[PDB]
Design a protein around this nucleic acid. Structure first.
Ligand SMILES: N[C@@H](CCC(=O)N[C@@H](CS)C(=O)NCC(=O)O)C(=O)O
Ligand SMILES: N[C@@H](CCC(=O)N[C@@H](CS)C(=O)NCC(=O)O)C(=O)O
Lengths: 236, 236
DNA sequence: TTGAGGCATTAACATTTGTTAACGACGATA
DNA sequence: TATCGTCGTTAACAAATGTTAATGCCTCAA
């Protein structure tokens, strides 16, 4: 992306150099209250939350370039306690102090509008996801998540659309769709397989019937069409 | 609150005058995508979405002052096809075309930071809502919505906490929690009534065991503590 | 006073999902 | 080689939830 590159050159120009993170490494966490402005430049991360009981919840993934806020810009208080775990092998991200961000965006308006637009992307994303997950229950939740991962990490292959993700354990899918037990998600997956919707090959997932997921995730497909059209046309 | 008043005067200085809307009246709609930037100054509204089969989905409410984006500020494209129905008797809102917002914000930076902060409140809200509703299924979703309504529209009474909403039918809660049929909502509400959690009196809902809802909506309570701390202190 | 329609409560069945357990395939270690 | 853990299936049983129908309470219009 161009806006992302200009943003990079701006940050670096203002003495803000990137940091490197490895897999299983947290950029910020839900226990230390350090309000940051993460500009995930390269890599893949997952935003997670752990309850008092210890239950994990995968709220979303982030694939650079994108912006993640852990604190408000005016009050400089916390927007919510979450972790951002690196799940790719390596990732490069620009950690910015919450106070300096205001000084940086005040100076340049283009980059300001870039951050604003990434924010809108977050909003619309969350609304669509909430819709498609809420209506059709857990089957619809799984289907929606598969749609997201297929548009973001999917590549056409002889047998279908291969989702290029190193770790996609049943536990992870459950964490992304509010399912606590791997057996249940394994059952839903078994149904989808039997309906000739997906295949489990090479420890990976191959999506062969995209329309089936489109039915259970209308607002998500619509969203990718209205906000990530470059990512949407690669499969249409 | 106050930043919204300064924002009001700002809008009334650039020739952007408020428009009035009555109950059930829509400001923008899904089928006629004109990209606006609604600044709900006063009143209560609800953001809804209708599938192709007619299924309704209540994504959330909006009690002024707040900001709603129907289109992106850069691309000027729709962020998603949603409707905004007024559910209060009367509501005052400033309608702004999306192309004007970029200049109007470029002119003043404090109000830019206001809209930005409100958008961050939207983000945190959606994330917390997604986590709680998702973790404990439909019971937890009902508890979450009830907590939200209790913080935003609740007022302490000797009978508990009165949710000052005229129209809060079983079907409306269902739409707010992804439940299609009113009978199921009635069933859950009956369980809570038996559990000494709430009571249905004077055509309104009264909350007596806030903690019970806090258990099923931890991230939402956290959100009210972090994003709307006054609304949170009003009940603690 | 009557009748229609909408909303709430409940019951009864079907479908889905939660929860635990057993079995087998796989990798890794010694 | 054997042994231990982890993950994917499947089964069996319980709880939740989807779905429909019946009933009663209320308002409203004639
Ligand atoms: N950098 C890309 C992708 C940014 C990104 O990661 N967006 C989030 C939503 S705000 C996403 O697609 N997440 C995918 C997921 O949740 O797995 C863009 O500009 O849209
Ligand atoms: N103006 C009030 C309320 C703004 C508002 O409506 N915020 C949304 C969250 S983005 C909300 O609380 N919605 C409650 C609901 O969904 O009923 C404030 O800023 O605290």
């Amino acid at each position: 992306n161009a806006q992302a590159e200009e943003f990079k050159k701006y940050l670096e120009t203002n003495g803000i150099k990137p940091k490197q993170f490895h897999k299983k490494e947290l950029i910020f966490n839900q226990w230390d209250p350090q309000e940051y402005c993460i500009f995930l430049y390269d890599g893949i991360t997952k935003l997670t939350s752990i309850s008092e009981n210890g239950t994990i919840m995968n709220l979303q993934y982030y694939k650079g370039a994108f912006v993640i806020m852990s604190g408000f810009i005016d009050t400089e208080t916390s927007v919510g306690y979450y972790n951002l775990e690196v799940i790719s092998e390596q990732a490069t991200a620009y950690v910015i102090k919450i106070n300096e961000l205001k000084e940086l965006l005040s100076k340049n308006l283009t980059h300001f509008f870039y951050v604003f637009q990434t924010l809108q992307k977050q909003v619309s994303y969350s609304l669509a996801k909430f819709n498609d997950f809420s209506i059709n229950g857990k089957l619809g939740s799984i289907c929606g998540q598969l749609l997201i991962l297929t548009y973001v990490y999917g590549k056409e292959t002889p047998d279908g659309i291969k989702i290029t993700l190193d770790n996609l354990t049943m536990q992870e899918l459950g964490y992304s769709s509010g399912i606590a037990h791997s057996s249940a998600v394994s059952r839903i997956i078994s149904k989808l397989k039997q309906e000739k919707v997906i295949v489990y090959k090479n420890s990976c997932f191959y999506v062969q019937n995209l329309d089936y997921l489109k039915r259970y995730a209308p607002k998500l497909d619509e969203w990718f069409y209205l906000a990530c059209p470059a990512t949407w046309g690669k499969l249409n």
